Amino acid sequence: IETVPVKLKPGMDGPKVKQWPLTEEKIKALVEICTEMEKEGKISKIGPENPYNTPVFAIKKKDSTKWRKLVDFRELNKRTQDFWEVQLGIPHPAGLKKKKSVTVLDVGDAYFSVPLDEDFRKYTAFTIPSINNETPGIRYQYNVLPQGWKGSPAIFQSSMTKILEPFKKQNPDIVIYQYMDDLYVGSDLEIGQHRTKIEELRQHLLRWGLEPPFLWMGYELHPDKWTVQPIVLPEKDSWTVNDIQKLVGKLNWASQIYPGIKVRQLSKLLRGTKALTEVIPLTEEAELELAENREILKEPVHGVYYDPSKDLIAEIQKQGQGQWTYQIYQEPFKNLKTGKYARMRGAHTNDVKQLTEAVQKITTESIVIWGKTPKFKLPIQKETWETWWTEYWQATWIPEWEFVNTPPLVKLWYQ
């Protein structure tokens, strides 16, 4: 009820980010949402003496026909002070990734009950654009903690901790983790119990609220089943010259990750200048080297550690037929997680919708395991991504990304 002082980082002005083009449907939705928010006091109209701006758009979350306002605070979040005073930071709970079920709840509406420091409000300015710029854009700023701003969970932490105390004491084996507007709730219960504890949790925030438009929703994850992708080599009875070349290529790549990989004996099977489809019998020497390589590949990689002071990087490859492979790392050749997806929801004709859902899934996994989002290197031209990603976004956070314009050879080795 009285505000926490907030300021930007030293020597750093507010965000001045262009509003990108919005569709008629998104504009009408935002006009309706912001008119209501203004009546409830959450935002106020501003004048031209405020030159700041953050982009805004709207999303229709999974299994809902109500539009949600999403502000892209990435620039403001970078420019905002670090909140290492409330706490040096809440240690990331390593047990969250080990629960059989984790439900994700949108609790962002709770933030609107805490006022925002009057000296910081100007930096949350945003614009609702008009079609064809025929009327001046509607300019607002926030009077309360906004959804998506990194300061909102930090300032609301003290209030969240006490709202949840009765539920936590009474359910001590539940893991609760907050990331931005998300609450992740993990249990080892059978799902029916799980869903009823989740609903127990909802009414603690309803009780306290006394209405939140998206608390009822529940995104269910099962991180104990999450699959990884070790390096496997083919098992064949007949090797062609082409098969052995692809094998030697893959092993050469794997030897940058695994020290003792050897290809001398397998490369000597390529002794001469043979037709690519010709079948080559393995020598005993080659079989032995191949088997020794297999056993090396069944071990973990050496010297792999997570460092919370370094960025996570996520790379994604398109494998075709709706299949995508991905790797998360901080140092090259030191993967912290690898994976593969194929359940591209409702996108069998749309590469970009599939890629966008992969990005959201990888971010979710990243939040659960390390409590932060990775920086993506996306196999897509910037213009195509920038024009379509917002049409398929269903998350309340937005990660960072860059674009890969040169095809990697590594695609072949993660297939």
Partner 1 sequence: MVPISPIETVPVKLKPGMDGPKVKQWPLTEEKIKALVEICTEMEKEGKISKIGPENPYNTPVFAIKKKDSTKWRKLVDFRELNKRTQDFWEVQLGIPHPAGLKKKKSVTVLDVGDAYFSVPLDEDFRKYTAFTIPSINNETPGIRYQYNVLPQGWKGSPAIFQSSMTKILEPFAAQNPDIVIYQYMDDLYVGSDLEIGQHRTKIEELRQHLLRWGLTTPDKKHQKEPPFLWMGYELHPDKWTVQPIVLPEKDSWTVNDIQKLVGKLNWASQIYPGIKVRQLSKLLRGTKALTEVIPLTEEAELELAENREILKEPVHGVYYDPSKDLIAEIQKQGQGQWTYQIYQEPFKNLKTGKYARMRGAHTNDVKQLTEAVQKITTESIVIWGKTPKFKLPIQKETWETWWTEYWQATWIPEWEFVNTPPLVKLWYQLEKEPIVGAETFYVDGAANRETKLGKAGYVTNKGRQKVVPLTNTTNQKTELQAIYLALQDSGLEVNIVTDSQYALGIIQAQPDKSESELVNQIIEQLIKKEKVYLAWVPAHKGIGGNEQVDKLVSA
Q: Applying CB under 8 A, does 240 fall inside the site for partner 1? A: yes
Minimum Å gap between C-beta 188 and partner 1 is: 37
The H or E element spanning position 157 is helix 151-170
Interacting residues of 212 by C-beta distance below 8 A, sequence separation 6+: 106, 107, 109, 110, 205, 206
- CB-based contacts of 366, cutoff 8 Å, min separation 6: 312, 314, 328, 372, 373, 374
Do 270 and 248 contact (CB within 8 A), yes or no? yes
Q: Parallel, antiparallel, or unpaired: how do β-strands 400-403 and 375-378 relate?
A: parallel
The CB-side HSE value for 117 (13 A sphere, CA atoms) comes to: 11
Among 92, 318, 340, 377, binds partner 1 (CB under 8 A): 318
The verdict on 352 binding partner 1 (CB under 8 A) reads yes
Phi/psi for 7 (5° steps) reads: -145, 175
Q: What CA–CA distance (Å, rounded) separates 14 from 46?
A: 15
- Applying CB under 8 A, which part among 66-74, 201-209, 282-290, 382-390 lies near partner 1? 382-390
| Stretch of residues binding partner 1 (CB under 8 A), selected from 96-104, 160-168, 239-247, 289-297 | 239-247
* 295 lies in the binding site for partner 1 (CB under 8 A): no
Structure tokens at 225: 């089943």
Q: Which is nearer to partner 1, 273 or 309 (CB)?
A: 273
Q: How far apart are CA 334 and CA 302, in angstroms?
A: 8
The nearer residue to partner 1, 18 or 310, going by C-beta atoms, is: 18
Our CB check for partner 1 shows the closer of 23 and 196 to be 23
182 is in an annotated binding site: yes
x/- letters, 263..292, toward partner 1 (CB under 8 A): xx--xx-xxxxxxxxx--------------
Site for partner 1 (CB under 8 A): which residue of 114, 248, 257, 301?
Answer: 248
Q: Is 181 part of any known ligand binding site?
A: yes
Q: Is 48 in the site for partner 1 (CB under 8 A)?
A: yes
CA distances to 265, 314, 413, 414 from 325, rounded to whole Å, are: 30, 10, 10, 7
Dihedral class, residue 333 (left if φ above 0, else alpha if ψ from -120 to 50, else beta): left
Instruction: Write the binding mask 119 to 158 for partner 1: x where contact by CB under 8 A, - elsewhere.
Output: ----------x-xxxxxxx-x-------------------
Q: Is 109 annotated as a binding residue?
A: no
For 67-84, give one letter per residue: b (16+ CB within 10 A) or e.
Answer: bbbbbbbbbbbeebbebe
Binding of partner 1 at residue 51 (CB under 8 A)?
yes
Whichever of 206 and 288 has its CB closer to partner 1, that residue is 288
Phi, psi of 142 (to 5 degrees): -85, 145
Cα–Cα distance measured from residue 183 to residue 181, given in angstroms and rounded to the nearest whole number: 7
- State the nearest-atom distance from the C-beta of 209 to partner 1, in Å: 32
Q: Which positions make up the binding site for Mg(2+)?
A: 106, 181-182
Q: Name the site residues for partner 1 (rule: CB under 8 A).
A: 21-24, 27, 47-51, 53, 129, 131-137, 139, 240-242, 245, 248-249, 252, 263-264, 267-268, 270-278, 318, 320, 350-355, 378-381, 383-384, 387-388, 404, 406-407, 409, 411
